[PDB]
Each structure stands twice: as structure tokens, then as C-alpha cells.
Amino acid sequence: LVRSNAVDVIIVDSVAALVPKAEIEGEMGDAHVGLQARLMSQALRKITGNIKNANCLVIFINQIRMKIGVMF
DNA sequence: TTTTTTTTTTTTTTTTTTTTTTTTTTTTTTTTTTTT
């Protein structure tokens, strides 16, 4: 959509819910340490250069997931 | 009978033998439990 120059505002609701295809194919709790993070990092690397050229918005939506082992 | 005298011209190719080198990471995820 963004590369087409047609649409100008794009919304991705709850980026946390876009599971990888590999994780879907595999069983529950197999592993997939950070695969979501790798996917998200690779996505931006490819679309940042097209978003500026197409003058679009890609407002992403996120969730609050409390972390462990943090005191202060 | 006596009695020798002088060279002239090039034609043709034939066959390949041998490898030499790696190069770079990429990414987090999720809390549990009141005690007197």
C-alpha cells in the first residue's frame, strides 16, 4: 500500500498480535526467542525509505507487557 | 679424319595445457502473592 503512493494513512493495530508465519506453523511454546523482534526490526528497515518518499503515516499500535528482573 | 659443350628449380605446417578463492550475524519475553 505505502509504495503505491495512493494511501496516506496506514494503521497497524496491536503490532504484538502479528505473529510470524513460522510460529504459526510450529507448535505452542516451541521457542522462537525474539523472532517477533527480528520481524519487526526487518520490517521498518524496508519501509522507512518508502514512507518518507510517499508522505504516508504508518502509526503502529503497541501493548504494555511488564518485564521481569527490573527493580528500579 | 679431327672433334665436345653447358644446368635447372623448390615444397610444406603442427598442436594447447591448467584452476582458484570465501564470508557475514540477528533478535528478546513474560510475573507472582497478602499477612496478623
Coil, helix or strand at residue A51:
helix
Question: Other CB atoms closer than 10 Å to residue A56's CB: what's the count?
Answer: 20
User: Residues for chain A: how many in total?
Assistant: 72
Work out the end-to-end distance of chain A between its first and last CA atoms, rounded to an integer number of angstroms.
42
Q: Round to whole Å and give the CA distance between A70 and A72.
A: 6
Q: Round to whole Å and give the CA distance between A3 and A22.
A: 26
Contact A14, A65 (CB under 8 A): no
Name the residue with cell 504494555: A64
Q: Which nucleotide is nearest to A45 (CA to C1')?
A: B26
Name the helix (H) or strand (E) containing A50. helix A35-54
Q: Round to whole Å and give the CA distance between A2 and A38.
A: 21
DSSP A62: -
Q: Round to whole Å and give the CA distance between A54 and A2.
A: 7
CA of A60 to C1' of B3 (A): 133
